[PDB]
Amino acid sequence: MKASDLPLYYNAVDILERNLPVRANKTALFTPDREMTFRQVSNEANQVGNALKGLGVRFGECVGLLTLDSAEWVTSFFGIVKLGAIAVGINTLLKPPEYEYILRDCRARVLIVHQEFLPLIESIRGNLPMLEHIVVIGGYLSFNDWIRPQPTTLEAAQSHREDICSLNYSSGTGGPKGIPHAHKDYPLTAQLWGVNVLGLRESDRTFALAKLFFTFGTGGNLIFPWYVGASCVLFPGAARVASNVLSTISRFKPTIFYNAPTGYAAALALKDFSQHDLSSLRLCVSASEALPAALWYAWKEATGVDIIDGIGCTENFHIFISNRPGDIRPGSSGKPVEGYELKLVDDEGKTVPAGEIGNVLLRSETAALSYWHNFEKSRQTFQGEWLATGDKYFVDADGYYWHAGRSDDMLKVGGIWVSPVEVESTLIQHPAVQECAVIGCPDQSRLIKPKAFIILKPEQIPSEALIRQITDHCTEKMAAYKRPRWIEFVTELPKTATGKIQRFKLRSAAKLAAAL
Ligand SMILES: Nc1ccccc1C(=O)OP(=O)(O)OC[C@H]1O[C@@H](n2cnc3c(N)ncnc32)[C@H](O)[C@@H]1O
C-alpha cells in the first residue's frame, strides 16, 4: 500500500482500534502474569491517555517507557500514541548515564518505569530538570492507582499521519541516535511486510524474543499481529535463558516465532531442545543479524519449521528485504519487498555491476525523515528518497541478496575485501561451534588478517584436533585470504540487547592487545 491510501489525519492507535468492537472479547496479549482482550487493552490505554492528561502531557511531547515486555508496556504505548504524545521505548539493559542522556534528549516530563529499574533512574533524578512525574509499575505514582480513577473512554488526537508518534534510541558505535517514526509507518510496515510477505492472519499468534523497545519486536510481536486481529505473547524474563523461551512456546502455543541467529543457536545448543513442544509454530522469523545457512537447516531439521530471514532497521521501522514462505534461500536476506525499492552503489554513489559488493540504498515511505538531535548524521544517512543503512550487500545470479556485513565490519586483506559474515557462516558449519565473530587484526607486520572469536557448544573445551578440524574446514570452504589467521576460543561475546555482536569492541580489544 501507499501513504496516500491512508487518511491525511491518522493515528496509530487504529492498529489496536481497527479490531474494535468485533474482536472485543478475543484475548489480545498473553503474559505469564496477565491476559487481556482487545477491549481490556483499549480501556486501559484510554485510562493511561486520560491519566497522562492529568500530568499535563500534550500532543508532540515525549513520554518515557522503560519496563519489561508486559501488558503495562502495551497499554502505556497505545495510551501515549492515542493522546498524540511521543512514546519513547527505552532499552531495558542500560546504564544510569545512558538513561540520563535519553531522558534529557527527549525532554521527557513523565516516565513510566518498572520498579526494578527505579533505582537506576533515582540516581540520575537531579540531572533531569524536565522530568516531573515518575509512574512506577510493580513517593511515586503506582501504575494501577494512577489509572484507576480515569475513565475508559478517550478521543484520539487529531494527528497528521506524518506526525511523530514514537522515538526509538538505537544503540550506536556513540552514543545512541534517536529515531522518530510517524503514525503512517505503523500500518504501512504492517501491510508491506507483515501481511504481504510474512502472511500474518487473524488466526495467528506471535511470540518474539525481541523486546518491545526493539522495532523488530515492536512490529512483529504487537503492531503487525494486531493489525490483522492476531494475538501476541510477551516474555518479561531474561532472554538469555533459552529453555524458558521454548517453554513459553509450549505453554502459550504461538504460531509465529521471532528471534535472532544468536538466539536460534543458543536454543539448538540445548541438549534437550526437542523436549519442548514447538508444534504450534507454522513459521519462524530471524533478523538483527544474518542467519547462517547452517542454522536454517539445523532448525529445519529439528523442528520442520522454515525460518524467514529478513533485514530491517530502526530507521525503516522494519524489514525491507525478506524471504518468503514460498521462496527461501538459506543464508540470504531473500528478495526485495514490494513497496520498497533497493539500490547497490559504490563508495562514490554509482550502481555497482551485478554480483559485486555495494552499499545499500533503501527507498521507503516508512523510513524516518531524520534523526533526533543528530543534524550531521541525518544528512549522512537520509539521502533524499534513498536511505543508507550502512550495509554491504551483493546479489545472486538468481536475484538473492547476501549480507556481506556492516560497512565497518568489512576487513581488507591484501587489498581484497573480506566479508566477516561469509567467514562466520563457514565457521558455524562445524558442529562444535555455537556462534562466532570475525574481525580484522594487524599481524605484527601490521597487515590486517582475519581473527575468529569462537564460542563452543556447552561443556566443550578446545583441543589440538578441534583447532585442526576448524582450520582444515576453512581451507576447504574459503579462499586463502579469507581464512582466519588466528582462532581464539571464548566463552562469551560482546552483545547488544538486540541480539547483535559488538564487533567494534572486539576490534578495539584486539588492537589494544596487539600493541602489547
Ligand atoms: N529494527 C529492525 C526491524 C526488523 C528487523 C531488524 C531490525 C534491526 O536490527 O534494526 P537495528 O536498528 O537494530 O539495526 C539494523 C542493522 O542490523 C543489521 N541487520 C538487521 N537484520 C538483518 C538481517 N536479517 N541480515 C543481516 N543484517 C541484518 C543490518 O546491518 C542493519 O543495518
For 283, list phi and psi in degrees, rounded to 5. Answer: -150, 150
For 118, list phi and psi in degrees, rounded to 5. Answer: -55, -45
Question: What Å distances lie between residue 124 and 97, 104, 121, CA to CA?
Answer: 7, 10, 5
Question: Would you state the torsion angle of the CA atoms of residues 73, 78, 79, 84, taken in this order, to the nearest 10 degrees?
Answer: 130
The closest of 393, 424, 429 to 295, measured between CA atoms, is 429
Question: Could you please report the per-residue DSSP string of 87-119?
Answer: EEE--TT--HHHHHHHHHHTT-SEEEEETTTHH
Q: Say how far apart CA 484 and CA 500 lie, in whole Å.
A: 21
Q: Say how far apart CA 455 and CA 269 lie, in whole Å.
A: 11
| CATH 3.40.50.12780 domain span(s) along the chain | 1-406
- Gap from CA of 486 to ligand 1 centroid (Å): 28
The closest of 259, 500, 269, 506 to 403, measured between CA atoms, is 500
Q: Are 89 and 212 in contact (CB under 8 A)?
A: yes
Ligand 1 atom closest to the Cα of residue 360 is 32
* Resolution for the entry shown, Å: 2.6
Ligand 1 atom closest to the Cα of residue 309 is 24
Q: Is 501 helix (H, G, I), strand (E, B) or coil?
A: strand
Q: Are 86 and 118 in contact (CB under 8 A)?
A: no
Give alpha helix (H) positions in 347-430: 375-381, 420-427
For 165, list phi and psi in degrees, rounded to 5. Answer: -125, -10
Query: By 3-state DSSP, what share of the chain in percent is helix, strand and coil, each rounded to 5?
Result: 30, 25, 40
| CATH 3.30.300.30 domain span(s) along the chain | 407-516
Q: Say how far apart CA 51 and CA 74 lie, in whole Å.
A: 15
Ligand 1 atom closest to the Cα of residue 499 is 9
Q: Is 216 in the pocket of ligand 1 (CB under 6 A)?
A: yes
Q: Is 289 in the pocket of ligand 1 (CB under 6 A)?
A: yes
Q: Is 307 in the pocket of ligand 1 (CB under 6 A)?
A: no
Question: Would you state the torsion angle of the CA atoms of residues 380, 384, 390, 391, taken in this order, to the nearest 10 degrees?
Answer: -160
Counting DSSP H helices and E strands in the chain, the numbers are 16, 26
CA 281, 282, 286, 291 dihedral sign is positive
Q: Are 273 and 243 in contact (CB under 8 A)?
A: no
Stretch (H or E) spanning 429: none
Q: Residue 151 burial by CB count (10 A; 0-12/13-18/19+): exposed, middle or buried?
A: exposed
Q: Say how far apart CA 271 and CA 483 lie, in whole Å.
A: 30
Pocket residue to mutate for ligand 1, from 311, 382, 503, most atoms within 8 A of Cβ: 311
Q: What architecture does CATH give domain 1-406?
A: 3-Layer(aba) Sandwich (3.40)
Q: Which CATH number fits domain 407-516: 1.10.3720.10, 1.10.10.60, 3.40.50.12780, 3.30.300.30?
A: 3.30.300.30
Q: Is 290 in the pocket of ligand 1 (CB under 6 A)?
A: yes
**Method in brief:** X-ray
* CA-proximal residue: ligand 1, atom 25 (nearest): 290
- Name the grid cell of 162: 506524518
Q: Are 38 and 16 in contact (CB under 8 A)?
A: yes
* CA-proximal residue: ligand 1, atom 27 (nearest): 289
Ligand 1 atom closest to the Cα of residue 170 is 12
- Gap from CA of 56 to ligand 1 centroid (Å): 36
Q: Is 318 in the pocket of ligand 1 (CB under 6 A)?
A: yes
Residue linked to cell 546479489: 395
Q: Say how far apart CA 111 and CA 131 lie, in whole Å.
A: 7
Q: Are 411 and 439 in contact (CB under 8 A)?
A: yes
Residue linked to cell 516508512: 366
Q: Is 316 in the pocket of ligand 1 (CB under 6 A)?
A: no
Residue linked to cell 533512574: 121
CA 96, 101, 107, 113 dihedral sign is negative
Q: Say how far apart CA 512 and CA 175 lie, in whole Å.
A: 21
